Design a protein around this ligand. Structure first.
Ligand SMILES: COc1cccc(NC(=O)N2CCC[C@H](C(N)=O)C2)c1
Ligand SMILES: [Zn+2]
Length: 139
């Protein structure tokens, strides 16, 4: 679990969104596993606007943060789950690191701010949904 709070927005994995997220929907994209909902309180996360390929992510299944090198956002095949059929997930970045399903929502950050959130993994890999291209999050 986990979310990004920036201004009047809340960014979560689309597969973990709640009834309130869907009732205050701003935008959602099944192909990216992202959903943004509006909030009544103000968000203070800084979104990174960069092309960093190194950062640190929070891994809840270890209660630890890990440094990682990650790939640039791209279309990556993802196996079927109770949430989606087998498909290509866009804007996804992979890194070699530990992750378990409950780790989804953990933030990945570089020196410029929030890069994305954990969205896929397994086999010693961790995938992050990028949010750096969503320029409307700050305006
Ligand atoms: C987050 O780390 C892991 C490790 C092992 C397994 C997993 N499960 C997943 O990757 N998925 C299941 C939930 C939906 C995800 C999606 N974006 O389509 C796919 C995650
Ligand atoms: Zn950066």
């Amino acid at each position: 679990s986990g979310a990004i709070y920036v201004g009047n927005y809340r960014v979560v994995n689309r597969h973990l969104a709640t009834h309130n997220d869907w009732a205050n929907l701003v935008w959602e994209d099944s192909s990216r596993d992202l959903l943004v909902s509006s909030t009544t309180a103000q968000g203070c996360d800084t979104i990174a606007r960069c092309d960093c390929q190194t950062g640190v992510y929070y891994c809840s299944s270890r209660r630890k943060h890990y440094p990682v090198s990650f790939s640039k956002p791209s279309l990556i095949f993802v196996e079927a789950s109770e949430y989606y059929p087998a498909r290509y997930q866009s804007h996804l970045m992979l890194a070699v690191g530990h992750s378990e399903p409950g780790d989804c929502g953990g933030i990945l950050r570089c020196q410029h701010g929030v890069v994305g959130i954990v969205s896929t993994g397994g086999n010693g890999l961790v995938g992050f949904a990028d949010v750096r291209d969503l320029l409307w999050l700050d305006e």
